């Protein structure tokens, strides 16, 4: 499901930035390496995603050094990742509790 | 805040699990979720109907008729839960490897 691929890619890209400011080609290599070559991101895909995240204030950019454009997770972005991770833990709990409670009937 | 696209996902995630554990009707679903959430999540009836209309359209669930309307997980539905779970395992692995590789990046330098 397209809805899901998008989410997972975003998930990953934010984790990369959560590990350090980086530029598009560095991000691509890092992901290709952490995925054992299973996820080879196109440049244009990253620009698409980052344009949305920059508009929503979840990331921002700036010039580094060979002059590269760097991307960073904002404070809001670290906050969304935190809210997200928490909300999903509760969800996994509630699922366990559904099972538990169902069996006790 | 939590993007609306994500609250929807979480709710769907939960609802499919309920159905994965047995065909059920809206009131039973609501009750079950309220109980398994220690009251923290009360789904509104009309919200369930809206979600189930989408899932029925996508054939993820189907329904049948005491007098309660029941909802069941289809085989497509069982399959998407499996694909979902697997896709997300790989994703967690990728993220574990990002951490790992970052730490050994940091050792060397």
Residue numbers in the entry:
A (entry chain A): 5 to 69, 74 to 113
B (entry chain B): 3 to 67, 74 to 117
Pull text from the paper.
We present a new class of ArMs featuring a genetically encoded noble‐metal‐binding site based on a non‐canonical thiophenol‐based amino acid, 4‐mercaptophenylalanine (pSHF), incorporated in the transcriptional regulator LmrR through stop codon suppression. Next, we investigated the incorporation of pSHF into Lactococcal multidrug resistance regulator (LmrR), which has been demonstrated to be a highly versatile protein scaffold for artificial enzyme design. We selected position V15 for incorporation, since this places pSHF inside the hydrophobic pocket at the dimer interface. Here, we report a new class of artificial metalloenzymes featuring a genetically encoded thiophenol for binding noble metals and the application of this design approach by the creation of an artificial gold enzyme that shows efficient catalysis of abiological hydroamination reactions.
